[model samples]
Target: GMIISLIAALTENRVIGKSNDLPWHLPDDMKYFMQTTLGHHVIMGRKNYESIPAKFRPLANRTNIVVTRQEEYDAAGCIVVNSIPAGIDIAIDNREAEVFIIGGAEIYTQSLAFANRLYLTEIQTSLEGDAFFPMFNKHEWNELSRKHHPLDEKHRYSFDFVIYEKK
Candidate 1:
């Protein structure tokens, strides 16, 4: 099967975003995110795509696929498609080993059920947020690996990079 994965960093309370940006900054988590998604196909919602800075818009070395409803949507360096499945189809045509769902909340909610793998950065603290990751049943997945990182100078909150596979 072509691996379909959801990659997100959320708090214990499921908060994934505040306003238009991350609630906190964790360099290590950012590094993990960049390394994991590099050289792969990444699908993200329109808003999620805009949240990234202009200079880093089409994230380097990856196929940047955006999902949006607007028929006239055009992003200079991206493959703008109408739906998540449309974006996934691009990955299929490209023979990508794994397609990453890099999300805003709605995209995750729609795609979670079919995603076979999850790369989650579980931030240790709960905080207020305008957006959230969908609550999923833990029993549906098996934890493949978990590496914890304690709070350090560059990271405000302690977190764990956890990988899970559908069982």
Candidate 2:
């Protein structure tokens, strides 16, 4: 069975992105992201995939799955699927303990019902962004672990790396 997991960073207001890119940068959060996702399968929307610079894309050490509607859509080193279901199928095929759904707003909204685990970096400040993570009830999840980090030279905002499992 494919264990669907979500990995995202959210602001105090639940904003995740603006103009198709993350609105803030926290170096330690980036490090935590890579540490959590390395060697796993990551499925994401086309825009999310494109946000990574070409040179560093198709992120190393993981299988990158891109969901797009364009019939001719193609990225040199990515597995392009027409729908999110197809991406999950690929994840299921891998038979890994977890398959990550990294996102854009729509993808996050759609995947929430399916994700069994969530890895969130809850930044302790609001950010201005056009995109937001879907509103989900906190009561339905069980916090599995959390680590807080304060502002430092490499990190811009104070945040917590929180992991939750669906209740």
Candidate 3:
């Protein structure tokens, strides 16, 4: 089955970002992201696509799909789609593969309905933030896996990596 995984870092209040950026930098989490998603196709919103640094743009060795309203812009090494469903269609057409949805608020909200799985990184701390992960009914999913890691020198806060499957 095709799966859509959402990977994000959030505060105790479930805040994902602030002022259009991540509220905190956890090196370990970043490393985990890079390691886990190295060669997978990643779909994201326009804002999230642009938020990536120039050096990291297009996310080397992976198919990049960006959902955006504007059609005139070029992403050099990415395919830009005007809608979430289109992006999912493209991913589906590409050998019926599963694609990871790396987000900005709106993309997650729109894609969750079609998502079969969620890969969440819950940060165990609270901070002021402007952007938050969308709230969903818990009955819709079943927990599949979970791993907890305590705060350390390199990772200033404790966190958990949890995987959930749609019920």
Candidate 4:
């Protein structure tokens, strides 16, 4: 079976996306995202899959699994599932390693309870957004590691790359 990980970036107020794409440009966080998710199965909501640029569809080197309630919907480079559990099953069959839930709000909310690990970039500021990362009880998680970075020219907000395991 695959070990599922929930990966995301959010502001202090849990703002994830503003109008579908990321509201801020943080290259350091992007690099961390890529390094952690590469070679793993990336399970995401349909909107998240659509949010990616067309040229980067399926995100090179990783298996793209999109979870959607719409059974009729299909994309060229993705394997679509009606539920998160089903998508995770396929990911397990394809790659018996880490599977990342790289998402939109809905998918993250759905998988929070079951994800084995979490890789989150927590920004220092609060952001205005329509979508937000759902709050999970901190007591249920054990912080494994955290790397802090100060705000620089490239990184607009100070952030911490934190890893957690379900405890």
For candidate 1, the lDDT comes to 0.88
Per-candidate Cα lDDT values, in order, are 0.88, 0.84, 0.79, 0.84
Q: How big is the positional error of residue 90 in model 2, measured in Å on the Cα after superposition?
A: 1.0
For 110-136, candidate 1 gives per-residue lDDT tens digits of 999779999999999999887889878
| Model 4 steric clash pairs | none
Q: Give the CA lDDT, 0 to 100, for residue 68 in model 1.
A: 87
Each model's total of backbone clashes:
0, 0, 0, 0
Any runs in candidate 4 off by more than 4 Å, and if so which?
Answer: none
Give the per-residue lDDT of model 3 (tens digit) for 28-117.
787887876777778877777777889878788788898888877788899888888887888778864567887767767888788888
Q: Model 1 segments beyond 4 Å from truth? A: none
Best candidate (score: TM-score): 1
Candidate 4, lDDT over the whole model: 0.84
Candidate 2 residue lDDT tens string, 64-89: 89888999897888798998889888
Model 3 misplacement above 4 A:
18-21
Q: After TM-score superposition, what is the CA distance of residue 147 in candidate 3 from its true location, in Å?
A: 1.4
